[PDB]
Amino acid sequence: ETTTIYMDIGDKKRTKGDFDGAIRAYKKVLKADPNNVETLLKLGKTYMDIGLPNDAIESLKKFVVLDTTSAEAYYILGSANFMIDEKQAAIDALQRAIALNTVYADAYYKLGLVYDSMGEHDKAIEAYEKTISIKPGFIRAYQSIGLAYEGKGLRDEAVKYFKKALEKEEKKAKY
């Protein structure tokens, strides 16, 4: 019961943006139920929300030990690593997300962002092209390829991608 009561109190607080309060509630669940993976993930995300990525990483690591086959958890872990410039740690976690779900569009996209940040613009473009192969409406992937091409001085190819991103934006907006 403690687990249900306080998980529900925490979500309510997190939803209202009372992140310190949600943390207290989630901590209370984990007192009784240290292996609660759902709260480990919520706590991790909430730590990310208040700018404490190392604490996020700790909580997400605990999750992934207990449930090793959640692509989402590895995606989030990867994102938290990226926030503290642990770029290879981000890559590794995102590659595990992708291995678990090879059609995980968001993980491919983030992987591209991590490659871009490392100066690895050709692997970034590939990661972005994979993203669009999964979700052809993933606008930010067209935009990021566009900008990768601007970086390469392929300015007409960049404009093709910017126009394609616009086309997708317009189709979206008209529904």
Footprint of Cl ion (CB under 5 A) = 120, 122-123
Q: What are 171's two structure tokens?
A: 């189709």
CA distance 88 to 143: 24
CB of residue 102 vs Cl ion: minimum separation in angstroms? 21
SS3 76: helix
Tokens read off for 52: 């404490």
State which residue, 85 or 122, has the beta carbon closest to Cl ion.
122
Q: Which is nearer to Cl ion, 55 or 120 (CB)?
A: 120
Contact residues for 116 (Cβ-Cβ < 8 A; gap 6+): 124, 144, 148
Shortest distance (Å) from residue 116 CB to Cl ion: 9
With respect to Cl ion, which residue has the nearer C-beta, 46 or 131?
Answer: 131
- Supply the minimum distance, in Å, between the C-beta of residue 17 and Cl ion: 39
